[PDB]
Design a protein around this nucleic acid. Sequence first.
DNA 1: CGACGGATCC
DNA 2: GCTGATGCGC
DNA 3: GGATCCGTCGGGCGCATCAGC
Length: 276
Amino acid sequence: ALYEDPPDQKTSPSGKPATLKICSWNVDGLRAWIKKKGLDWVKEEAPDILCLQETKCSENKLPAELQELPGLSHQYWSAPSDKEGYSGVGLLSRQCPLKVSYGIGDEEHDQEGRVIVAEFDSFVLVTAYVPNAGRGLVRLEYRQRWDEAFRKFLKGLASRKPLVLCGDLNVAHEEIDLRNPKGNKKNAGFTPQERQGFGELLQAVPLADSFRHLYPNTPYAYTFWTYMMNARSKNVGWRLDYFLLSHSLLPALCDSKIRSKALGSDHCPITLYLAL
DNA sequence: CGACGGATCC
DNA sequence: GCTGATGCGC
DNA sequence: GGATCCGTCGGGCGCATCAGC
Ligand SMILES: [Cl-]
Ligand SMILES: [Mg+2]
């Protein structure tokens, strides 16, 4: 079945206006995405903070267009040292963060280009591109060990400010989160192991899934569709992209959006409105 | 990873 | 420099 | 025998490298 995201709720449950708009997008090759007009869409969305995953681009190769974003002038980029044509993440912000760091503990030695942490006045933002279990699950055990290291890292953050974790967490948590649950239980993104890891992430940190909090029983809401077999035209998809929030931020949560119509990748953007 | 062919279930 | 094939991973 | 369950298979994407010219 097709899906139509409901209108933007820009007011909190207690009536407070949203003050912060965050957009996250796995762009599947930043340079390709820009050629497919992805930045034109970003300009229309006008987020305060933009988080990008799978940039597949070292910072020296960023298109000049990215320098022509006055409203997102503070930009932080990370790419793996070994395999530059893969992974890569970015965080772009209207206001300058207080602190920016990279990775989950040892990036200076294992520069993976998957995680950026930025502290702002009232909250800490983490964006992540979680490692894929791979075709045939050949890297599933590495993904499980990474999941564990990531949980521990997030739990270990020194700041007492609430956390927003966003990005491509590369798992459909529950059956409602993809079109073909039965057929994919032995595929990357929907193994019991990855689902369990997501459940453990939520419990251990702890975090709430902003979209599912607001729309607990809404099916056919996806953020990824394989380029194969015209899957997007049939809305045969997976919800892989999340905004996860500290419990203390739920009163500030206005809406969590899925921007189904925005093209340029095999993922679509997601957008968060907070009243801070 | 969705499409497909084959087997199994009541 | 530029194209298109192959390799790799998503 | 329609629905379900399950394993196998071919192929869209982007980017790096390579061969050729
Ligand atoms: Cl940077
Ligand atoms: Mg991808």
